[PDB]
PDB file of C-alpha atoms and ligand atoms in Angstrom:
ATOM      1  CA  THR A   1      -4.055 -45.016 -22.091  1.00  0.00           C
ATOM      2  CA  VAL A   2      -1.176 -44.030 -20.201  1.00  0.00           C
ATOM      3  CA  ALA A   3       2.148 -43.387 -22.269  1.00  0.00           C
ATOM      4  CA  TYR A   4       5.568 -42.637 -20.716  1.00  0.00           C
ATOM      5  CA  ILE A   5       7.754 -40.772 -22.719  1.00  0.00           C
ATOM      6  CA  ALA A   6      11.450 -40.195 -22.067  1.00  0.00           C
ATOM      7  CA  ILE A   7      12.753 -36.720 -22.729  1.00  0.00           C
ATOM      8  CA  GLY A   8      16.997 -36.564 -23.697  1.00  0.00           C
ATOM      9  CA  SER A   9      18.307 -33.359 -24.757  1.00  0.00           C
ATOM     10  CA  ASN A  10      22.138 -32.688 -25.701  1.00  0.00           C
ATOM     11  CA  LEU A  11      21.993 -29.204 -26.071  1.00  0.00           C
ATOM     12  CA  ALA A  12      24.524 -26.630 -24.061  1.00  0.00           C
ATOM     13  CA  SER A  13      21.602 -24.902 -23.173  1.00  0.00           C
ATOM     14  CA  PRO A  14      18.440 -27.532 -23.259  1.00  0.00           C
ATOM     15  CA  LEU A  15      15.484 -25.820 -21.478  1.00  0.00           C
ATOM     16  CA  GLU A  16      14.154 -23.663 -23.734  1.00  0.00           C
ATOM     17  CA  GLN A  17      14.022 -26.402 -26.580  1.00  0.00           C
ATOM     18  CA  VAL A  18      12.873 -29.296 -23.277  1.00  0.00           C
ATOM     19  CA  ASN A  19       9.798 -26.421 -22.675  1.00  0.00           C
ATOM     20  CA  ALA A  20       8.726 -26.252 -26.206  1.00  0.00           C
ATOM     21  CA  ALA A  21       9.018 -30.018 -26.258  1.00  0.00           C
ATOM     22  CA  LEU A  22       6.739 -30.259 -23.100  1.00  0.00           C
ATOM     23  CA  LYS A  23       4.370 -27.950 -24.836  1.00  0.00           C
ATOM     24  CA  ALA A  24       4.249 -29.578 -27.682  1.00  0.00           C
ATOM     25  CA  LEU A  25       3.310 -32.881 -26.016  1.00  0.00           C
ATOM     26  CA  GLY A  26       0.102 -31.194 -24.530  1.00  0.00           C
ATOM     27  CA  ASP A  27      -0.659 -29.827 -27.982  1.00  0.00           C
ATOM     28  CA  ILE A  28      -0.977 -33.500 -29.219  1.00  0.00           C
ATOM     29  CA  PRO A  29      -4.790 -34.219 -30.201  1.00  0.00           C
ATOM     30  CA  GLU A  30      -6.501 -36.638 -27.759  1.00  0.00           C
ATOM     31  CA  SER A  31      -3.434 -36.164 -25.226  1.00  0.00           C
ATOM     32  CA  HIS A  32      -2.583 -34.206 -22.421  1.00  0.00           C
ATOM     33  CA  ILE A  33       0.331 -33.905 -20.036  1.00  0.00           C
ATOM     34  CA  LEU A  34      -0.128 -36.042 -16.582  1.00  0.00           C
ATOM     35  CA  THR A  35       3.198 -35.101 -15.415  1.00  0.00           C
ATOM     36  CA  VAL A  36       6.710 -34.719 -15.784  1.00  0.00           C
ATOM     37  CA  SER A  37       9.537 -35.938 -13.634  1.00  0.00           C
ATOM     38  CA  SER A  38      12.290 -33.972 -12.297  1.00  0.00           C
ATOM     39  CA  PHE A  39      15.181 -32.726 -14.973  1.00  0.00           C
ATOM     40  CA  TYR A  40      18.466 -34.722 -14.658  1.00  0.00           C
ATOM     41  CA  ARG A  41      21.778 -34.333 -15.754  1.00  0.00           C
ATOM     42  CA  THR A  42      23.965 -36.930 -17.101  1.00  0.00           C
ATOM     43  CA  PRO A  43      27.465 -37.086 -18.431  1.00  0.00           C
ATOM     44  CA  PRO A  44      27.641 -37.054 -22.297  1.00  0.00           C
ATOM     45  CA  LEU A  45      28.413 -40.200 -23.994  1.00  0.00           C
ATOM     46  CA  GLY A  46      31.840 -40.907 -24.909  1.00  0.00           C
ATOM     47  CA  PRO A  47      34.411 -37.594 -24.428  1.00  0.00           C
ATOM     48  CA  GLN A  48      33.481 -34.926 -21.821  1.00  0.00           C
ATOM     49  CA  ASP A  49      33.818 -32.177 -24.087  1.00  0.00           C
ATOM     50  CA  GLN A  50      30.445 -32.022 -24.855  1.00  0.00           C
ATOM     51  CA  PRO A  51      27.405 -30.613 -22.591  1.00  0.00           C
ATOM     52  CA  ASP A  52      25.842 -32.846 -20.082  1.00  0.00           C
ATOM     53  CA  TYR A  53      22.183 -34.625 -21.284  1.00  0.00           C
ATOM     54  CA  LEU A  54      19.175 -33.712 -19.845  1.00  0.00           C
ATOM     55  CA  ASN A  55      16.859 -36.044 -19.175  1.00  0.00           C
ATOM     56  CA  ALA A  56      13.287 -36.416 -18.055  1.00  0.00           C
ATOM     57  CA  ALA A  57      10.023 -38.802 -18.119  1.00  0.00           C
ATOM     58  CA  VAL A  58       6.430 -37.721 -18.882  1.00  0.00           C
ATOM     59  CA  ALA A  59       3.452 -39.531 -18.388  1.00  0.00           C
ATOM     60  CA  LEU A  60       0.933 -38.507 -21.431  1.00  0.00           C
ATOM     61  CA  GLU A  61      -2.733 -39.581 -21.012  1.00  0.00           C
ATOM     62  CA  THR A  62      -3.669 -40.478 -24.894  1.00  0.00           C
ATOM     63  CA  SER A  63      -6.196 -42.188 -26.877  1.00  0.00           C
ATOM     64  CA  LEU A  64      -4.388 -42.102 -29.889  1.00  0.00           C
ATOM     65  CA  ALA A  65      -3.056 -45.283 -31.354  1.00  0.00           C
ATOM     66  CA  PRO A  66       0.634 -46.055 -30.614  1.00  0.00           C
ATOM     67  CA  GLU A  67       2.359 -45.464 -34.509  1.00  0.00           C
ATOM     68  CA  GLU A  68      -0.212 -42.138 -34.460  1.00  0.00           C
ATOM     69  CA  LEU A  69       1.542 -41.052 -30.822  1.00  0.00           C
ATOM     70  CA  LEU A  70       5.111 -41.859 -32.910  1.00  0.00           C
ATOM     71  CA  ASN A  71       3.924 -39.569 -35.659  1.00  0.00           C
ATOM     72  CA  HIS A  72       3.537 -36.710 -33.063  1.00  0.00           C
ATOM     73  CA  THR A  73       6.541 -37.315 -31.464  1.00  0.00           C
ATOM     74  CA  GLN A  74       8.196 -37.415 -34.556  1.00  0.00           C
ATOM     75  CA  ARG A  75       7.269 -34.211 -35.882  1.00  0.00           C
ATOM     76  CA  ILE A  76       7.982 -32.670 -32.692  1.00  0.00           C
ATOM     77  CA  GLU A  77      11.605 -33.789 -32.745  1.00  0.00           C
ATOM     78  CA  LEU A  78      11.662 -32.622 -36.508  1.00  0.00           C
ATOM     79  CA  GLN A  79      10.161 -28.984 -35.313  1.00  0.00           C
ATOM     80  CA  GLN A  80      12.054 -28.519 -32.189  1.00  0.00           C
ATOM     81  CA  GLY A  81      15.420 -30.423 -32.611  1.00  0.00           C
ATOM     82  CA  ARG A  82      18.292 -30.791 -35.378  1.00  0.00           C
ATOM     83  CA  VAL A  83      20.560 -33.416 -36.847  1.00  0.00           C
ATOM     84  CA  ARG A  84      23.686 -33.908 -34.909  1.00  0.00           C
ATOM     85  CA  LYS A  85      26.398 -33.935 -37.736  1.00  0.00           C
ATOM     86  CA  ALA A  86      28.785 -36.055 -36.000  1.00  0.00           C
ATOM     87  CA  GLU A  87      26.300 -39.123 -35.962  1.00  0.00           C
ATOM     88  CA  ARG A  88      23.434 -37.957 -38.486  1.00  0.00           C
ATOM     89  CA  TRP A  89      21.431 -41.028 -38.413  1.00  0.00           C
ATOM     90  CA  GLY A  90      21.689 -41.295 -34.821  1.00  0.00           C
ATOM     91  CA  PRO A  91      19.243 -39.381 -31.926  1.00  0.00           C
ATOM     92  CA  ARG A  92      18.552 -35.736 -33.009  1.00  0.00           C
ATOM     93  CA  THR A  93      19.354 -32.822 -30.461  1.00  0.00           C
ATOM     94  CA  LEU A  94      15.958 -33.486 -28.795  1.00  0.00           C
ATOM     95  CA  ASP A  95      14.853 -36.948 -28.462  1.00  0.00           C
ATOM     96  CA  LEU A  96      11.681 -38.308 -27.477  1.00  0.00           C
ATOM     97  CA  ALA A  97      11.504 -42.034 -26.781  1.00  0.00           C
ATOM     98  CA  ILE A  98       7.982 -43.958 -26.258  1.00  0.00           C
ATOM     99  CA  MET A  99       9.163 -46.349 -23.774  1.00  0.00           C
ATOM    100  CA  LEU A 100       5.902 -47.353 -22.562  1.00  0.00           C
ATOM    101  CA  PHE A 101       2.732 -47.415 -24.242  1.00  0.00           C
ATOM    102  CA  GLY A 102       0.102 -48.550 -21.320  1.00  0.00           C
ATOM    103  CA  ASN A 103       0.564 -52.287 -20.927  1.00  0.00           C
ATOM    104  CA  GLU A 104       0.892 -53.054 -24.398  1.00  0.00           C
ATOM    105  CA  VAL A 105       3.410 -55.087 -26.193  1.00  0.00           C
ATOM    106  CA  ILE A 106       4.411 -53.537 -29.773  1.00  0.00           C
ATOM    107  CA  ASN A 107       6.737 -54.670 -32.428  1.00  0.00           C
ATOM    108  CA  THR A 108       6.725 -52.973 -35.828  1.00  0.00           C
ATOM    109  CA  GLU A 109       9.193 -52.000 -38.167  1.00  0.00           C
ATOM    110  CA  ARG A 110       9.219 -48.063 -36.638  1.00  0.00           C
ATOM    111  CA  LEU A 111       8.237 -49.091 -33.097  1.00  0.00           C
ATOM    112  CA  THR A 112       9.366 -51.221 -30.251  1.00  0.00           C
ATOM    113  CA  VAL A 113       7.324 -50.731 -26.754  1.00  0.00           C
ATOM    114  CA  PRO A 114       8.895 -51.154 -24.421  1.00  0.00           C
ATOM    115  CA  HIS A 115      11.885 -49.652 -25.504  1.00  0.00           C
ATOM    116  CA  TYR A 116      14.080 -52.132 -26.253  1.00  0.00           C
ATOM    117  CA  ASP A 117      17.226 -51.358 -23.916  1.00  0.00           C
ATOM    118  CA  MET A 118      15.396 -49.072 -21.460  1.00  0.00           C
ATOM    119  CA  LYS A 119      15.540 -51.839 -18.763  1.00  0.00           C
ATOM    120  CA  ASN A 120      19.734 -51.497 -18.706  1.00  0.00           C
ATOM    121  CA  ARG A 121      19.656 -47.399 -18.518  1.00  0.00           C
ATOM    122  CA  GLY A 122      19.153 -45.592 -15.125  1.00  0.00           C
ATOM    123  CA  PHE A 123      18.970 -42.750 -17.073  1.00  0.00           C
ATOM    124  CA  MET A 124      15.640 -43.661 -18.211  1.00  0.00           C
ATOM    125  CA  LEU A 125      14.416 -45.890 -15.169  1.00  0.00           C
ATOM    126  CA  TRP A 126      15.077 -43.356 -12.581  1.00  0.00           C
ATOM    127  CA  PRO A 127      13.135 -40.337 -14.088  1.00  0.00           C
ATOM    128  CA  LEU A 128      10.395 -42.932 -15.018  1.00  0.00           C
ATOM    129  CA  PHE A 129      10.412 -44.299 -11.043  1.00  0.00           C
ATOM    130  CA  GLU A 130      10.249 -40.769  -9.854  1.00  0.00           C
ATOM    131  CA  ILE A 131       6.293 -40.627 -11.390  1.00  0.00           C
ATOM    132  CA  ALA A 132       5.569 -44.116 -11.544  1.00  0.00           C
ATOM    133  CA  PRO A 133       7.249 -45.922  -8.354  1.00  0.00           C
ATOM    134  CA  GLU A 134       4.673 -48.683  -8.856  1.00  0.00           C
ATOM    135  CA  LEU A 135       5.036 -49.362 -12.396  1.00  0.00           C
ATOM    136  CA  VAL A 136       4.749 -52.789 -13.744  1.00  0.00           C
ATOM    137  CA  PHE A 137       6.205 -53.901 -17.003  1.00  0.00           C
ATOM    138  CA  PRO A 138       4.070 -55.661 -19.618  1.00  0.00           C
ATOM    139  CA  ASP A 139       6.247 -59.006 -19.191  1.00  0.00           C
ATOM    140  CA  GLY A 140       5.559 -58.250 -15.205  1.00  0.00           C
ATOM    141  CA  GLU A 141       8.731 -56.907 -13.677  1.00  0.00           C
ATOM    142  CA  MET A 142       8.284 -54.670 -11.549  1.00  0.00           C
ATOM    143  CA  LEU A 143      10.335 -51.132 -12.028  1.00  0.00           C
ATOM    144  CA  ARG A 144      11.199 -50.952  -8.553  1.00  0.00           C
ATOM    145  CA  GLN A 145      12.614 -54.467  -8.657  1.00  0.00           C
ATOM    146  CA  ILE A 146      14.919 -53.534 -11.713  1.00  0.00           C
ATOM    147  CA  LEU A 147      16.419 -50.352 -10.293  1.00  0.00           C
ATOM    148  CA  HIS A 148      16.993 -52.472  -6.986  1.00  0.00           C
ATOM    149  CA  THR A 149      18.211 -55.633  -8.093  1.00  0.00           C
ATOM    150  CA  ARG A 150      20.205 -53.660 -10.914  1.00  0.00           C
ATOM    151  CA  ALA A 151      21.723 -51.130  -8.205  1.00  0.00           C
ATOM    152  CA  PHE A 152      22.124 -48.396 -10.858  1.00  0.00           C
ATOM    153  CA  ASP A 153      23.447 -45.555  -9.458  1.00  0.00           C
ATOM    154  CA  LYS A 154      20.824 -42.365  -8.790  1.00  0.00           C
ATOM    155  CA  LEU A 155      21.174 -39.511 -11.169  1.00  0.00           C
ATOM    156  CA  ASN A 156      22.039 -35.784 -10.676  1.00  0.00           C
ATOM    157  CA  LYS A 157      19.544 -33.153 -10.447  1.00  0.00           C
ATOM    158  CA  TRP A 158      19.594 -30.414 -13.223  1.00  0.00           C
TER     159      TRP A 158
HETATM  160 CL1   CL B 201      22.864 -26.278 -17.174  1.00  0.00          CL
HETATM  161 CL1   CL B 202      19.655 -29.249 -38.959  1.00  0.00          CL
HETATM  162 CL1   CL B 203       8.496 -55.666 -20.559  1.00  0.00          CL
END
């Protein structure tokens, strides 16, 4: 199964963390990276005093179950990132989001795939489109059609 994972970091100096997270994704059992998007830079949500966000998409080949993949992505978040004391129960300094898991629709207490809001997020769709321009969502909507119709601005490269 090809899973598509969104990497987000809000560290002032995120490259070391992001590269560590990429290596860690590869170390996941029964899984390996197929490709990684360019790194993209987007404005911090709210006040602009905060560093830019680093955004990227990863194609991960895997034979794990979706929940098993989630276990590992959560572990990597714990090991490579930290709580943001400004929003403790929100995203950590490193966020790994499972955007898509093959053509599967998954709804559980701990996991919703496709990611519940990704179709509204240029910062998730653009890096995904770079590595998977022909992508079709489980409901049959085309990634390319969403980007074109919604007219999201392109992102700046890191
Ligand atoms: Cl920078
Ligand atoms: Cl911490
Ligand atoms: Cl869908």
